[PDB]
C-alpha cells in the first residue's frame, strides 16, 4: 500500500482527458518511440493473422496503446482509493501470460515507460511537471508490477 493523493489521481486523470482527444496520434507516437529505443520489440508485432506484417502496420498498436494510458489512469484511481492496484485475477493472469507469451521482459517494461512519460511530456506541455511524473510513473510502476506477478508466477 503507497500514499497516492487525489492531487496525484487528478495530475493523471485530467492529462489523460485532455490527451484522448488525439489518442489515435498518442499511441502511434508511442510505438514509434518504443520501436525507434529498441527495434527488436517491432518482431513482437511483425506477424498478423499467421503471416508476415510490417509491424508499424499491425491493427493492434493503437488498441494496446490506448490500453496502456486507460489501464495507467484505471490504477491511478485505484492507488488513491486504496493504495494499490487491483487487476481483477482472471484477466491480470491472462494478460500475464500474453506477455510472457511473446517474450516481454523487464527491459521492454522499462523502455515503454521512458516512452510514456516522453509521449505525456510532449502531449502536454503546460500541465507537464516533476509531480505529473511522478504520478503517471506511479501509477505504471504498479500496473506493471502486477502483470508481472503473473508473469513470473507459473
Ligand atoms: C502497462 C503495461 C501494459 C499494458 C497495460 C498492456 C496491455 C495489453 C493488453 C490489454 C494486451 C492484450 C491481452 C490479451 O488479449 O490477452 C496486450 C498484449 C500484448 N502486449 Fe501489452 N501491455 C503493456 C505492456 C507491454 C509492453 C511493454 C510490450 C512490449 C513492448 C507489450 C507487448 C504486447 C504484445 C506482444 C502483446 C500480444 C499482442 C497480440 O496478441 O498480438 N506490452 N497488452
Given at each position: 500500500?503507497?500514499?497516492?493523493?487525489?492531487?496525484?489521481?487528478?495530475?493523471?486523470?485530467?492529462?489523460?482527458?485532455?490527451?484522448?482527444?488525439?489518442?489515435?496520434?498518442?499511441?502511434?507516437?508511442?510505438?514509434?518511440?518504443?520501436?525507434?529505443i529498441?527495434?527488436?520489440?517491432?518482431?513482437m508485432?511483425?506477424?498478423?493473422?499467421?503471416?508476415?506484417?510490417?509491424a508499424?502496420?499491425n491493427?493492434?498498436?493503437?488498441?494496446?496503446a490506448?490500453?496502456?494510458?486507460?489501464?495507467?489512469?484505471?490504477?491511478?484511481?485505484?492507488?488513491?482509493?486504496?493504495?494499490?492496484?487491483?487487476?481483477?485475477?482472471?484477466?491480470?493472469?491472462?494478460?500475464?501470460?500474453?506477455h510472457?507469451?511473446?517474450?516481454?521482459?523487464?527491459?521492454?517494461?522499462?523502455?515503454?515507460?521512458?516512452?510514456?512519460?516522453?509521449?505525456?511530456?510532449?502531449?502536454?506541455?503546460?500541465?507537464?511537471?516533476?509531480?505529473?511524473?511522478?504520478?503517471?510513473?506511479?501509477?505504471?510502476?504498479?500496473?506493471?508490477?502486477?502483470?508481472?506477478?503473473?508473469?513470473?508466477?507459473?
Amino acid at each position: 500500500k503507497i500514499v497516492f493523493t487525489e492531487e496525484q489521481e487528478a495530475l493523471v486523470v485530467k492529462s489523460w482527458s485532455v490527451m484522448k482527444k488525439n489518442s489515435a496520434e498518442l499511441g502511434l507516437k508511442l510505438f514509434i518511440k518504443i520501436f525507434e529505443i529498441a527495434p527488436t520489440t517491432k518482431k513482437m508485432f511483425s506477424f498478423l493473422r499467421d503471416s508476415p506484417i510490417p509491424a508499424e502496420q499491425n491493427p493492434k498498436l493503437k488498441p494496446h496503446a490506448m490500453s496502456v494510458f486507460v489501464m495507467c489512469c484505471e490504477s491511478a484511481v485505484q492507488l488513491r482509493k486504496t493504495g494499490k492496484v487491483t487487476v481483477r485475477e482472471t484477466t491480470l493472469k491472462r494478460l500475464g501470460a500474453s506477455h510472457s507469451k511473446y517474450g516481454v521482459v523487464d527491459e521492454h517494461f522499462e523502455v515503454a515507460k521512458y516512452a510514456l512519460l516522453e509521449t505525456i511530456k510532449e502531449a502536454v506541455p503546460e500541465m507537464w511537471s516533476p509531480e505529473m511524473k511522478v504520478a503517471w510513473g506511479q501509477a505504471y510502476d504498479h500496473l506493471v508490477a502486477a502483470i508481472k506477478a503473473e508473469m513470473n508466477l507459473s
